[PDB]
Design a protein around this ligand. Structure first.
Ligand SMILES: Nc1c(/N=C/[C@@H](O)[C@H](O)[C@H](O)COP(=O)(O)O)[nH]c(=O)[nH]c1=O
Ligand SMILES: [Zn+2]
Ligand SMILES: [Zn+2]
Ligand SMILES: [Zn+2]
Ligand SMILES: [Zn+2]
Lengths: 359, 360, 359, 359
């Protein structure tokens, strides 16, 4: 029964899916005398938390009742009384938490606020799905680095274009279309300058249900990005460029004018780890790395990815000189190439979508 | 439905020939008189009785006024013994259920005609698709004069065949190499470029429990660079045909021919793929399993010489420009010129994923 | 996608099962710009309705929003404004209703009420599920009688006991446990005194969380019930009895003191139509008739049942004097035996549950 | 592999189903140097055996090969060399027998005959499957008694007619047709006179090519069967009647002179063990009992049945004086009621088909 209630809270939590953005998915359910009296979930960013909705709905039935939470109630004092505080102020007898707040220092603080108030706190109830619930958010809080998704599309023989650079029909509209989803479940979209110089993409989420465009990150070592590029001029969404001291001073000035954020790395070449650290320090919790087989290579080589997604088309391109999926340095010996694990393999239209993860 | 049941049986009996019938296609036959099965047959051995002989014999006198289900058109040529359409006619059978006609467009229907001339009802097309899968390759050879080509390869998830240094030790799983082995059993030949011989020195032999008459080994060469050293040469475990060219030495040429090793020679300085298969199609080879060489695979691909693409991806990323890839060589320069295929299968095998695709 | 929401609504309704007493289960979800902004369900008798909870949660987002409701929003003016009104005043622009009110005096009332406010109303999405959800309740309101389920356990040859009355071991523990589910989805459990004499059952619900117990109803023509049976002494659940004028007046007194409520019918034989009418008047909307072969026979003769559930065990009890499933008068010609329709066939343990319905 | 061949044999054997009359189904596979060279089944009564077909087919290859036989090769020295010898004269080195001959008298002779000749014999391969193949036949041999199947059609509450006797069709047309299949797989059909003088049946297998009608056995305590009943007249299928000494002598002569095979029991009531005894003596290996509530009770009380098949119509008949499935004496105490086991549940039209089996 405590299982049902946690499950209930997990399902209630999934209903927030993609509406809380930076904030995580939390589900709350209040039970009094064996009867559900409160149900809630975090449905919007910067608005009422899950416990809030559950307890107001709980009314006076909250007194001496139980409450299930998918994620340790907050103790964030300030503009509002912490949910941990709302929990005791209502007379909640016992609280069931599935997992602690991933933020290192914050972890345990909410449990402690309620225990020292006399409340019996039981944890770990269905921590398993409560983990898959906020996979990226968790990672970002625990590691301090953004959850990274690498996505690429190619032919069945692993080429991403012909030997003349042609790549007009690799994957079907359905794949490109499916790839778009990931552009709304990530705080940022990252690609190299080559992509921009080559395709001049807009990197914006076209799906007819958006209201918070991801940050468009560009790794541009030498700052050769074309100034007229949509990613600078269409000014539809945020655009951040990472260069080095090899950038042209006046140009950075000219671009910043258009409202472009320019980060000058202190190293002479761009190091992915340094870039990721900065994106976290700036509040980015996830990045969808779309292009630059070289960019992908740098990510793969540094072990800077949590998930890999490749779309394969029923087509053989061939070519000694046709560009492959993972460019760059690459591992020298098989005894050193990290073993991944296939997480999913679903067909999308006529192509095949494979997805693997680390270790 | 009862009709489909009997043809199903027929098809299922045929399969017991799966083993040895050599170039002969699998065939089944069942005779039913007054709603009773009275004769079952299948082609079991090369050069021996056809499914109808066995079946018609087993039915004895019940054949008179009976029905018969054959998964393939009854033969109609005149050799050492009477053909099966004649056998059927002579036996009193009233009606024949034929799943599919003959492959040879020069012989197809010739049998239906005979029985039909003899007043036998000939109903066609029952479980024709299953009967088509049954002898899929044989059917292809007869209908194209060309060997059924299957291209298989194992690689990283990012399409690499080895590291930039040539290392390819732990590329795919033992289960995948196991699954691959099956194919050496459904093909008469095993194609592989000379680079592969000197690369790992393979045997290209089938070790799956139960194997008669090993598949013919085929090494594509140019300068007869095949190292006299060993395996496909001084490993008398089966046949080894080596397609070569002019530049092929004169001395060592006959030196290897001494080990029962064959030596074909092409009048070109490039071992054009379509020429090789056509030669094979002459030598009775009806199927080829090419597993060696990105370049060798490239050729078959650019030439459009394949009926099956089978790739094994491991959950590994190798990357590295200068890391060999699945298919190399010429290839297509324009996307509009890339032939679209069709994935016919997705099967997880161990930690790896095996993808199989087919043309248009 | 419309169905996705209605289904969420139907699932939110299920959380209030057995907490609404006589009211139905209602789910409500307020959707705005592709975002779930409010969720609700009726959780407590006489307490807030689904729409009340969903709109409150929805807050300002209610404006121009859409709301899915599983049962027609109420439209009568009681102590608090009806829900239809609650919707009008909140700014909801579109309403998705699964089904209209079961009452003919109310159906569509609220619908028209909302269109009249300029709101767009669509109907019938997932009507079937919305129909099942409150199925018994629905029946009670449309016919004015409680939903009746007849249940029995017999041997494969249709015997409910041997010729000596022995019925020990006719159903497995698995079957008995599965049958217990109905003691939770029904407001009363009814048997004739015969069952009280032979088995002296408690007729209580003994599943995990069992907040409320169903009303135990005994049919006892002469009030010859044993004064020391559980149904009269355990106090675990309400006990009501139906007798005739022949009952001993001092015994009713004695029994009333134990808390038993007695109903004295004006006829000389108990009429199922009568009792059903009285239970309805008391607000009993569902009856789980555990039996007595004769009791079932009457319920069948009168055609006073909506569901038949027999459990058959892999055993043969012979006997000409062995009691069969349904006794009483029964039908004379195969032309008069009403037809049913097998609704389900489930194996539970080594037994096989067969459930069927009329027409 | 060892078992693959034996499976194929079993598969070949199933092909002669229904075409062998009273003979067992048998398959055979000859394997030479890892290749199937012979395959045979026994397809027609009194014709070539399984081994004979396979041995012929295999021809020259038979020498030094193996042979998988689903049933021990015959060893009687009749008017030709039995299969055991035939195997021997063929050079087959090894033999795989799935199960020995059911006849205790011969069981083994064959296996010995071959072994005593240098043949390596191994029995048991897929013995359980080879046992399901000829269930009814094997039972007969192993017990000297007919395999018996009790079949009945009843209402959902277990009645086989109204208290009037009207069985104007409880089960559906689809139901009766499905039941004929049995009149096809059993060598005899049995009903009591009650059934005869109330339905005046033909008890014939009106299915496809019968090529052999089942014996019609009627139980007549006093020989009161109507001398105008279909079974007595119609000369379509044989008809055997069992009676006691209460029957008239002339009546026995009339009927006997019309073909009826009359058997007289020297006991007051007819005793099932005795009828099965007689029937087995007369060759009859199986009997399909579908008639008589009391007749069914007698078979159940004696324990004389290998299979019970009940068709339940979605109908409720009712009535205390309505005939139930199994009457007779039945079991007085539930601790004496034998435990059966459900074997199959299949819906037929609007009716349900339950089949069970002993222990
Ligand atoms: N009453 C029913 C049955 N009744 C079965 C027996 O009582 C009949 O006497 C017997 O099947 C007649 O066989 P016939 O004339 O040779 O076809 N059997 C059924 O399956 N459904 C029934 O509703
Ligand atoms: Zn909070
Ligand atoms: Zn032939
Ligand atoms: Zn309301
Ligand atoms: Zn024999």
């Amino acid at each position: 029964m405590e299982e049902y209630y946690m499950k209930l809270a997990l399902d209630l939590a999934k209903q927030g899916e993609g509406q809380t953005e930076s904030n995580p998915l939390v589900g709350a359910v209040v039970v009094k005398d064996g009867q559900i009296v409160g149900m809630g979930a975090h449905l919007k960013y910067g608005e009422a938390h899950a416990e809030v909705h559950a307890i107001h709905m709980a009314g006076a039935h909250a007194e001496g009742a139980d409450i299930y939470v998918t994620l340790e109630p907050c103790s964030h004092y300030g503009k509002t009384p912490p949910c941990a505080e709302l929990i005791i102020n209502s007379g909640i007898k016992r609280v069931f938490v599935a997992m602690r707040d991933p933020n290192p220092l914050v972890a345990g603080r909410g449990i402690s606020m309620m225990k020292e108030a006399g409340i019996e706190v039981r944890e770990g109830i269905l921590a398993d799905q409560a983990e898959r619930l906020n996979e990226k958010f968790l990672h970002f809080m625990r590691t301090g680095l953004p959850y990274v998704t690498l996505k690429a599309a190619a032919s069945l023989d692993g080429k991403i274009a012909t030997s003349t650079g042609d790549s007009k029909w690799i994957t079907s509209e359905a794949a490109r279309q499916d790839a778009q989803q990931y552009r709304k479940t990530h705080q940022s979209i990252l690609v190299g300058v080559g992509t921009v110089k080559a395709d001049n993409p807009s990197l914006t989420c076209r799906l007819p249900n958006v209201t918070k465009q991801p940050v468009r990150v560009i790794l541009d070592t030498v700052l050769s990005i074309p100034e007229d590029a949509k990613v600078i001029c269409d000014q539809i969404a945020p655009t951040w460029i990472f260069t080095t001291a090899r950038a042209d001073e006046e140009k950075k000035k000219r671009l910043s004018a258009f409202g472009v954020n320019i980060f000058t790395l202190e190293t002479e070449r761009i190091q992915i780890p340094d870039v990721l650290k900065i994106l976290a320090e700036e509040g980015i919790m996830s990045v969808y790395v779309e292009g630059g087989s070289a960019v992908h290579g740098s990510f793969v080589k540094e072990g800077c990815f949590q998930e890999i997604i490749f779309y394969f088309a029923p087509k053989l391109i061939g070519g000694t000189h046709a560009p492959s999926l993972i460019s760059g340095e690459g591992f020298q010996s098989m005894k050193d190439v990290p073993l991944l694990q296939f997480t999913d393999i679903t067909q999308i239209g006529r192509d095949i979508k494979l997805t693997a993860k680390p270790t």
